[PDB]
């Protein structure tokens, strides 16, 4: 009589704690999936950055004969299509791929830079 | 009686399943806490690289008026203690803290750089 009246309580209360726990689990799962996806994107991004920073440090003024085409548009050099350098990356380009001058740490007066390095300086 | 027997079981099984679920809840929390900690850590890392990167992509030839001391030894500039620039970072140094020349992407010939940037460009 009162025996089953209390067992139902224990049971009903249990089948209820379960439903709650299960919900908490689907919850933490999604949040885990969410944060896991982000920490992985950070791992890739950190390797991407360290690598680019490294490549930016090796930068050196290129030797003319080593570059036969504009490092930006691929145009070939000749007597009519002369060489120019970017004071930022040290690469060689035609005049149309280095028509802009910018303020760099190498000179007080703006110097020649390629389009890529120009936009990097944020201006 | 068979009714009382069944109920007890229903309940025991319920208790069994709850235990499993509670451990799982704590497992997912442990993992979510570790990942959430790893996220903030790697995030600060990439930010620091962004900072160092943006900090370089904003360096210009420092104005002499805005630098009253060698960016390296604090040595103050005078009529005799002249100002000099490092072509890699654009900062100002005394002749003693910028007595070295190195190869940069800004010129074909070695240019004046501070001790830092020299050894920075691996000597
Ligand atoms: O006059 P030229 O014979 O074209 O010589 C070129 C110029 O001196 C370019 O200077 P610039 O970058 O200031 O144009 C330089 O970057 C090239 O390496 C040289 O081949
Ligand atoms: O000649 P001075 O009167 O000292 O003028 C300084 C020199 O021209 C320095 O050239 P340098 O770095 O190539 O020596 C330059 O870095 C400073 O900005 C100038 O104020
Ligand atoms: Zn070109
Ligand atoms: Zn460039
Ligand atoms: Zn320097
Ligand atoms: Zn000094």
Curated annotation (Swiss-Prot), chains A, B:
Resulting phenotype, residue 61 to A: Reduces phosphatidylinositol 3-phosphate binding and endosomal location
Residues that hold Zn(2+) 2 according to the record: 86, 89, 114, 117
Assembly and binders: Homodimer. Binds STX6. Binds RAB5A, RAB5B, RAB5C and RAB22A that have been activated by GTP-binding. Interacts with RAB31. Interacts with ERBB2. Interacts with SAMD9 and SAMD9L. May interact with PLEKHF2.
Miscellaneous remark of the record: Antibodies against EEA1 are found in sera from patients with subacute cutaneous lupus erythematosus and other autoimmune diseases.
Listed result of changing residue 85 to A: Abolishes phosphatidylinositol 3-phosphate binding and endosomal location. Abolishes pH sensitivity of the FYVE-type zinc finger domain
Effect annotated for changing residue 86 to A: Abolishes phosphatidylinositol 3-phosphate binding and endosomal location
Protein name: Early endosome antigen 1
ZnF segments: FYVE-type: 64-122
Residue window of the full protein shown: 1289 to 1411 of 1411
Effect of residue 77 to A: Strongly reduces phosphatidylinositol 3-phosphate binding and endosomal location
Record organism: Homo sapiens
Entry's localization field: Cytoplasm; Early endosome membrane
Binding site for Zn(2+) 1: 70, 73, 94, 97
Record remark: domains: The FYVE-type zinc finger domain mediates interactions with phosphatidylinositol 3-phosphate in membranes of early endosomes and penetrates bilayers. The FYVE domain insertion into PtdIns(3)P-enriched membranes is substantially increased in acidic conditions.
Tree of life domain: Eukaryota
Protein function: Binds phospholipid vesicles containing phosphatidylinositol 3-phosphate and participates in endosomal trafficking.
Effect caused by changing residue 64 to V: Reduces phosphatidylinositol 3-phosphate binding and endosomal location
């Amino acid at each position: 009589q009162d025996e089953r009246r209390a067992l139902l309580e224990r049971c009903l209360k249990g089948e209820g704690e379960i439903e709650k726990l299960q919900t908490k689990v689907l919850e933490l799962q999604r949040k885990l999936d969410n944060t896991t996806a982000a920490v992985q994107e950070l791992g890739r991004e950190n390797q991407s950055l360290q690598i680019k920073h490294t490549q930016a440090l090796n930068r050196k003024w290129a030797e003319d004969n080593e570059v036969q085409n504009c490092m930006a548009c691929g145009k070939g050099f000749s007597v009519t299509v002369r060489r120019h350098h970017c004071r930022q990356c040290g690469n060689i380009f035609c005049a149309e791929c280095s028509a802009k001058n910018a303020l760099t740490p190498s000179s007080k007066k703006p110097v020649r830079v390629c389009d890529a390095c120009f936009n990097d300086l944020q201006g």
